[PDB]
Structures are given as C-alpha cells and as structure tokens.
C-alpha cells in the first residue's frame, strides 16, 4: 500500500 | 475535476 500511495503522490506532484 | 485532483494531492501531502 505504501508503493501505491507514493505512485499517486509522484504522478500528481 | 481540477478540484478532485487537488483534494487527492492535498490529502497525500
């Protein structure tokens, strides 16, 4: 789940 | 949809 959150954060930054 | 994207970004910041 940490992987999934960081991917969304990186897509939107 | 801009508002929705900003709500996700702000939740994860």
Residue numbers in the entry:
A (entry chain B), B (entry chain A): 1 to 13
Quote the study on this structure.
Here we demonstrate that the active core peptide of hLL-37, containing residues 17–19 (hLL-3717–29), formed supra-helical highly stable fibrils that interact with bacterial cells. To conclude, the atomic structures of human and primate antibacterial LL-3717-29 showed a functional supramolecular nanostructure of densely packed amphipathic helices.
Our determination of the crystal structure of hLL-3717–29 at 1.35 Å resolution, revealed self-assembly of amphipathic helices into a densely packed and elongated hexameric structure forming a central pore. There were two helices in the asymmetric unit of the crystal, with 67% of their individual solvent accessible surface areas buried within the assembly, indicating compact packing. The interfaces between bundles comprises a network of polar interactions, including potential salt bridges between Asp26 and Arg23/Arg29 from two adjacent helices, and between Lys25 and the C-terminus of an adjacent helix. The fibrillar assembly in the crystal structure created alternating hydrophobic and polar (positively charged) zigzagged belts on its surface, suggesting interactions with and disruption of negatively charged lipid bilayers, such as bacterial membranes. The overall stable assembly of LL-3717–29, which includes a network of polar interactions and hydrophobic packing, corresponded with the thermostability of the fibrils, as visualized by electron micrographs after heating to 60 or 80 °C. Alanine substitution of Ile24, the most buried residue within the core of the four-helix bundle, abolished antibacterial activity against M. luteus and against S. hominis.
